[PDB]
């Protein structure tokens, strides 16, 4: 199906002494493949998937150089933004950046994005056409004018449609054995009783990849949303994901309820019953 490469960057200022904390992570789909942490000893971009280790010393030198350049822009940005918003030196502040590209099932460019936030709020983002900017406020509007004169959007559009897509395809090929594998969820149902009137049914999906999944309950063949609880999809820690959905039902009526699971690793949706 479709694929993505996405980079996530966070810098957090440290008022009293020294530069900000900088953390950078890179993903292909739901697999992290690289990291840089400004607090780590190596001061290098580090591998986090075995298929990226195929890449040579030039890759590591070049990714390290760029990620440190990312870090220094963020450092400059924290001071600039403190100035824009008339803030003091005492408080800690955050900048977050996400960019990347989506490709479809044919592995051709679908979508590119580049967005940026200050203290957890939209600051500025590249629009879908990759030719213009969305500035949330007047500070961001000053940045937009700066970036328009400097033709920033044009440089980003070339990367997002070019290099980004090219290297995603490359990573997808080198990591084929895992990145192009789907892991279907392992499903089961649990039952608990609160009193002698009331039962909880829990439908589990475990060990699945990619993260995207739909779990729903039906009652007598119709969708049931009331008296249900659906948890956030969560990492197992081994690269796979977990989720569950529970429904509260009257004891003895368990049979009316079916759990339905949709995932790309399943050719048709699966049904579970107690």
């Amino acid at each position: 199906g479709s694929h993505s490469m996405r980079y996530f960057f966070t810098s957090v200022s440290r008022p009293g002494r020294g530069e900000p904390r900088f953390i950078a992570v890179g993903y292909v789909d739901d697999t992290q493949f690289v990291r840089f942490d400004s607090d780590a000893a190596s001061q290098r971009m580090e591998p986090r998937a075995p298929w990226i280790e195929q890449e040579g010393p030039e890759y590591w030198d070049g990714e390290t150089r760029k990620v440190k350049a990312h870090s220094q822009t963020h450092r400059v940005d924290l001071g600039t933004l403190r100035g824009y918003y008339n803030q003091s030196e005492a408080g800690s502040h955050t900048v977050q950046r996400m960019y990347g590209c989506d490709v479809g099932s044919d592995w051709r460019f679908l979508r590119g994005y580049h967005q940026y936030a200050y203290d957890g709020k939209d600051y500025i983002a590249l629009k879908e056409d990759l030719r213009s900017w969305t500035a949330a406020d007047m500070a961001a509007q000053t940045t937009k004018h700066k970036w328009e004169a400097a033709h920033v959007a044009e440089q980003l559009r070339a990367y997002l449609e070019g290099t980004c897509v090219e290297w995603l395809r490359r990573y997808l090929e080198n990591g084929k054995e895992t990145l192009q594998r789907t892991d279907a969820p392992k499903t089961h149902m649990t039952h608990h009783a609160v009193s002698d009137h009331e039962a909880t049914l829990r439908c589990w999906a475990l060990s699945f990849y990619p993260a995207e999944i739909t779990l729903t309950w039906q009652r007598d063949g119709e969708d049931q949303t009331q008296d249900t609880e659906l948890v956030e999809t969560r990492p197992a820690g081994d690269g796979t994901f977990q989720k569950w959905v529970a429904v509260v039902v009257p004891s003895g009526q368990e049979q009316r309820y079916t759990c339905h699971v949709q995932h790309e690793g399943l050719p048709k949706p699966l049904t579970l019953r107690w």
Binding site: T73, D77, T80, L81, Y99, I124, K146, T163, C164, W167
Partner: peptide, 9 residues
């Protein structure tokens, strides 16, 4: 592969 350049705000 990271973007070659990152403009300041």
């Amino acid at each position: 592969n990271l973007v070659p350049s990152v403009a300041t705000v």
